[PDB]
Amino acid sequence: GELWGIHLMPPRILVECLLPNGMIVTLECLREATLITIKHELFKEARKYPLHQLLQDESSYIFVSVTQEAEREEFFDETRRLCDLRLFQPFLKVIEPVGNREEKILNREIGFAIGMPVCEFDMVKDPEVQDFRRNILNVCKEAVDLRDLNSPHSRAMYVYPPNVESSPELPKHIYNKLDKGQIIVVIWVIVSPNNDKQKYTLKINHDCVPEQVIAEAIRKGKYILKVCGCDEYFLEKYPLSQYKYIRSCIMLGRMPNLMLMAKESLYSQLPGETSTKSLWVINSALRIKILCATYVNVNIRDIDKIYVRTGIYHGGEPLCDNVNTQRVPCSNPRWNEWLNYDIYIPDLPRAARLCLSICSVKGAKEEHCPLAWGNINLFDYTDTLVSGKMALNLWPVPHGLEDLLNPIGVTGSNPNKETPCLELEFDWFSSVVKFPDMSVIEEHANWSVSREAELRENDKEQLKAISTRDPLSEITEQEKDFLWSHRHYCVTIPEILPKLLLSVKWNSRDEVAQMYCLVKDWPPIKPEQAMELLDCNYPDPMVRGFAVRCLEKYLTDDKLSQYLIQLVQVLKYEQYLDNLLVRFLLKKALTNQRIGHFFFWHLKSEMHNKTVSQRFGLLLESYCRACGMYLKHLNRQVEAMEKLINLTDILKQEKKDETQKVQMKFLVEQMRRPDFMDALQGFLSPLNPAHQLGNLRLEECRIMSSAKRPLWLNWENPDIMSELLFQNNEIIFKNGDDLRQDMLTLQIIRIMENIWQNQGLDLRMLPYGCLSIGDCVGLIEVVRNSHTIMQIQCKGGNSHTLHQWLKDKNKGEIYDAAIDLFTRSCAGYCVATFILGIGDRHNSNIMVKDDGQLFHIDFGHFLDHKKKKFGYKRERVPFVLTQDFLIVISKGAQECTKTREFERFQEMCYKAYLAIRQHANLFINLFSMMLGSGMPELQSFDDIAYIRKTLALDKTEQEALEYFMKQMNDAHHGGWTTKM
Amino acid sequence: MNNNMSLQDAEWYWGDISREEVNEKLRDTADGTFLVRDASTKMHGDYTLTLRKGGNNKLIKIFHRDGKYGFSDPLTFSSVVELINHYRNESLAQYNPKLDVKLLYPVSKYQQDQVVKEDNIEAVGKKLHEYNTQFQEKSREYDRLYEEYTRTSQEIQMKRTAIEAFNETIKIFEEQCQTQERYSKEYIEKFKREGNEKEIQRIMHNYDKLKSRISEIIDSRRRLEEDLKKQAAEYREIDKRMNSIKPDLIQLRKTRDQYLMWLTQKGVRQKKLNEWLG
């Protein structure tokens, strides 16, 4: 709401103006008006009130008031209007402005972008937070020096980076569609103020450089090529086919349209003394006293007893047996007992954590349940072992978590203090107890192997057999002993590192020290493999440090943007606020505005979530401080989305008992107002920052049928060459539902597609844009000319209706290409949905384009989330090809299951299925990185195991292929012709 | 007697089941809890012994060559039952000093026979339908409480911020009184030594209007603090309701799973299982 307790204030509204003489002037003013208007009306009316003699000129003063977030915000920008101020209550205090005005503007702009005031960070007393704020500025100042190094071209590379593929090489089917390795491209040029269009159609090699494309146009340097429609520029000297726009035009078979523009035109647009002791000197077992918990929300009658479950963890792995406290009544939670753990203090590894929870319990049978949970890092960010007494405010248990502890969850106290507060006490030996340096660890590693006591062919083939196991395929104790025994020989096959790391005794400084020395000179590996070592089962700083340096060397900005969702979520598993990964991501975010756009939005989307508000808020501050000119563009997006939140909240809450046309009148009325017209027009699409959103086609904007009230919005493309690419941009805003599952599902579909295209299979998927931007707030891209199956064939109490529509839309000799595209589309989506286990496909879920491209929408739940509330172990098939679909593939044959087209269709599904099976590690790693996200469908490794069962990773390639055939046959009731 | 028993009839042998099914059965179990399953058809070996030690699942593979089973060469044991029953009595320290633990607590596949003693297939099928309906009812009850729990948590957080915003608003209006008090001291003194009660009347009227507005704003903050205590009690009440339903959901699910396990055993048609569940 725009004023606490109200959504929108009406035109007439009173405001209490507090003058600096001491008087209080109640004032009439209109809702639309600005501060300079209100200040004119104030000091005019102030003459009538006493002590107007003492008052100075209107220009001398500035308005001040309290905002929604309890900040004393000063209103320097007097063009802002009353409703956009976000006041707590309608009052304004005039005073003389003081302090650094340059900084106060920027702190407000950063505070508006983040979603909380900067002054809240200033009043944090944790030294790790203030260390981060000062230290992270080193990365920020390093980043801005990179983009200012080769100015002004490197500055243009930041704002308009080359949106390219990872490799210049093309597949066979992509290359073979070209005319002997050449593409016909149209370069447009603007003529005059009259601005009438003329074009120059060229024909040149696919791997030309943007400089060489300009040289050919001047026949028919000093210039740059821009994509018509978008704000996307080919500044870098890549091959022309490597750009995504040109590569997409080759697949789609459309004429690429570029605009010639001056290089000078674009460039002008942008600007007491301590007693320290080593850990390995402490000769003692670990013990942690649990004193008492303040309270817990338990019904005294129903629960029998309560206790404090506890355990020492290295990631997910417990380093020793879990220790419980004695069982005590619910009314008085009090323990005061030293819990003894079977582990030597020196053997505690660097990333060791205390995980604990208060647990309720109910012929000697009982159900144990978590009430609240919390985790603590045993060593703080400065390598200091925790000591003495401390309080821990416990977190609420997430939805569906039946485990008694929560090792994967974030460490640290709950900021909400009105909360169950477990008090505990660690040992105290000296003032400080430090974890040793790497030099001391090297000495113990050499010392350990000294006291201990040819790579054969049978042994060499076992290392390849073990390395081919997927991440969640558990290695055996023989394989652990084998991997450890040949740990020095494992360097020759560096992809085995994750298997070797799990074979280490992490509760043993001997074996950890020897592993540290191997990791120090370990050969680097491909980024997609290194992303495995960033999940919750690899918490050691050295192992993570190695993983980040592999990304620094080999991760392209294409793949960084591709995998950005998982890399942001992985920051939740990090023990400390300052780390190598956050520095790596932040630097890339500040040297590439495409990355920095989504980097902002992925962090911004979870600022409601109090488990990461401080980490993500601090990280956003670093970005918004250093990103420069784009902060202005992001606040326009933020203000636009916040106004769309306000209207949908009114429709959901206030206008719930109203007809849909009455809601449209209200929506159109409020959107017509000037404050909404300014905010919701002339800003970049959050789904794609290259897409400029102009004026609203307000007559064509609509509310959708759902009870949560989504808005089908429609913007003009203000680009002067919009007619070539697209004239309007349609986006679906949604306020009620969680779209993180669709966002992830659509990310995976894009990755699945990219795997198939690189491996020869031309299976065109349609991963439409879907970005979550808040607590169940997100945007969805609208595909043009997309029709559901229900639209082609009307419901009522014929099978061939689908094939008849497709033949009409693609009549003539083009028919065959449309059936091919349809058949290829169905193949990928049949395989994709079976692997991922998405919701059941019906005619409203499935959609088809005019050219014949089939695709899915509304994924929702996935990995078969309804295998809870449904005990079956069978892996269901979501997209079942009914008689309607098989006729389109088989081209009007009645025996559609026994055709050459259906056999050819089956071969694509098998080749597609094995392609994803062979890249199973990637997808398993990607899902493992999302386990801390808070999505109900990805809470534990047991949830990720669904894709192992569908891909059949505990079976042979031929057995897995045989498994796939059986599941299709059972779903199709024999229609899916067996190989026999 | 024991060593002459077949591998099929053994309580701890579970056959073709996934590593996930083993993890569920060994989760939050004591040391020496174990069961044997069929190995992965991708990897070498016949069976996989999965036992508990230090709160971790230790997978030990059982190989075979020429009528002899074991963990590594040389393969000494006659059968899998002889291998297991040996390490039921003797420690695994013999094999590897790391895991000093016996195979103490077998996860029996005749454990469900205790929980579901009734023999008839249609009777167990009907009780699975009944237990599943009680689970679906309690689950929708829990989901509805969790909707309230999150909405109540958010509305408390909205109110909590508004208390600080009220307090900053009161501070500013109290600073306005400090501004009025100090500047009006000298000016009212000029208008009292001179006869100007007309000016005092409309200055003291303005001071009353300020203090009246402070009383109303302090009331609105006072009323909100009662609404915070009201809504904070609803949060604690909803949390209590959820913590009574939580243990019921586990007991209903575990019972439903063991009833579904008993019909997964003695393989029933998937059509019949889906009819009872729905």
Ligand SMILES: Oc1cc(NCc2ccccc2)cc(-c2nc(N3CCOCC3)c3occc3n2)c1
């Ligand atoms: O990724 C998703 C998720 C959901 N979930 C529920 C939802 C969300 C918004 C509005 C209504 C239901 C819905 C859609 C979704 N997408 C649509 N598309 C997107 C692609 O281009 C064509 C239009 C829909 O056209 C008519 C209905 C509808 N629903 C897509």
